[PDB]
């Protein structure tokens, strides 16, 4: 039973996985373009996600990106966070190298 | 040798379908994912893009339409309409549902 | 409900024929010791 | 250009004429362009079936690009790579879809 | 309210700055006030999680 | 393995189960108010289902 239940478990590789679960809290910065994306979103998945975060308590939103990083690192995998891809990769290289980006980008943007 | 190069993308498809894991073939990301929907859905993309690229609307130089076309592009992009249509013409039109085919695989018997 | 066959299902009949023949082969070898 | 799924013929495309003949991602996109920029449009396939490479000999862009250089096409809306060599002669808009080189493999099925 | 751009955006609109080179997200609202170059780094929303070390 | 795979399977008790699968085909009458309900549908589940039947 241990090995079986162990094998059933799978790592998240799409935001949809969060929609399919609830064990792991997830969210974005308390303010910024990012949350407004989900708020304006019409895709059913992202809409479900924003609908979730708006209702979920205590609220997933955090005051600062650093605070979100701390909330992820200390949650021991029970709290995923969402942020700009390049920023995520830039953090993942940083010590303690305890956190990592997963999956493809949810959407397109480009600095110019 | 024999050369990894192939005359056509279709040739690459023919090799990879015959490769049985002996060979892998690079190509344009959206095209690859577009193949993923296609039957027999044997193919699968792996890894991120090697390099950024982006198709864009082209207009003759000095065309008056230029700027309005541009604003129209960004406007449609932010509305997510592009992603919507992408989900349409790719996955929604897909011959093989990815998580649909993934949900459907529970056999048995014994070697 | 399957009759008899359901017990047989987990392991193929051929595999049974094989274990039988193999056991028969093992069996005589002890006699060779005698 | 004729590229699935961006541009595809109708099952009864022979039975149909005009914009009715065409369907695809670029079709929906261009339709949205017609919506926002407000204009009539009639889709036309490029004659050589090519994106429009610049000849290194005649120093002449062919294809859709030559159609732009020579005004044969009012505007281009195709899966067309943006490049510095092309931007100089014709004006690309901000790209509508980031993409890159990607790895295709058959999905593993060991036994 | 004031409809006044702030930040680097204001610095461009108000002539305070000659050119902007920064991780500046393109937006339609900023497109009409100043002129972006073509994007030099595709990017988007992404998932950060704890790294799953075994013990 | 047989008993385990046996217990994992569950009877359908919501249309959503169909949306989450594909192995069992599903549909309605070729015409009628019912089909109209799905083509006019805006609920994500029913929309997914009608989208499915639309191309299947
Ligand atoms: O502007 C360009 N846009 C292109 C768009 C596509 C497609 F994906 F089909 F839309 C393709 N294909 C990739 C798949 O196999 C069929 C042809 C080639 C393109 N090329 C040729 P390159 O010079 O080798 O990049 C361009 O130049
Ligand atoms: O043009 C924009 N470019 C931006 C670039 C970045 C960064 F990633 F740092 F480069 C960030 N951050 C995300 C990480 O935490 C620190 C600030 C915000 C940006 N915003 C504000 P938004 O409205 O919250 O997106 C813009 O407007």
UniProtKB/Swiss-Prot annotation, chain E:
Detected in forebrain. Detected in dendrites of neuronal cells. Expressed in the pyramidal cell layers of CA1 and CA3 and in the granule cell layer of the dentate gyrus. L-glutamate binds at residues 23, 25, 30. Induction: Down-regulated in the pyramidal cell layer of CA1 in the hippocampus by global ischemia. Palmitoylated. Depalmitoylated upon L-glutamate stimulation. Ubiquitinated by RNF167, leading to its degradation. It comes from the Eukaryota. It is found in: Cell membrane; Postsynaptic cell membrane; Postsynaptic density membrane. Ionotropic glutamate receptor that functions as a ligand-gated cation channel, gated by L-glutamate and glutamatergic agonists such as alpha-amino-3-hydroxy-5-methyl-4-isoxazolepropionic acid (AMPA), quisqualic acid, and kainic acid. L-glutamate acts as an excitatory neurotransmitter at many synapses in the central nervous system and plays an important role in fast excitatory synaptic transmission. The postsynaptic actions of L-glutamate are mediated by a variety of receptors that are named according to their selective agonists. This receptor binds AMPA (quisqualate) > L-glutamate > kainate. The M4 transmembrane segment mediates tetramerization and is required for cell surface expression. Homotetramer or heterotetramer of pore-forming glutamate receptor subunits. Tetramers may be formed by the dimerization of dimers. May interact with MPP4. Forms a ternary complex with GRIP1 and CSPG4. Interacts with ATAD1 in an ATP-dependent manner. ATAD1-catalyzed ATP hydrolysis disrupts binding to ATAD1 and to GRIP1 and leads to AMPAR complex disassembly. Interacts with GRIP2. Interacts with GRIP1. Interacts with NSF via its C-terminus. Interacts with CACNG2, PICK1 and GRIP2. Interacts with GRIA1 and SYNDIG1. Part of a complex containing GRIA2, NSF and NAPA and/or NAPB. Belongs to the glutamate-gated ion channel (TC 1.A.10.1) family. GRIA2 subfamily. This is Glutamate receptor 2. It comes from Rattus norvegicus (Rat). The gene is Gria2.
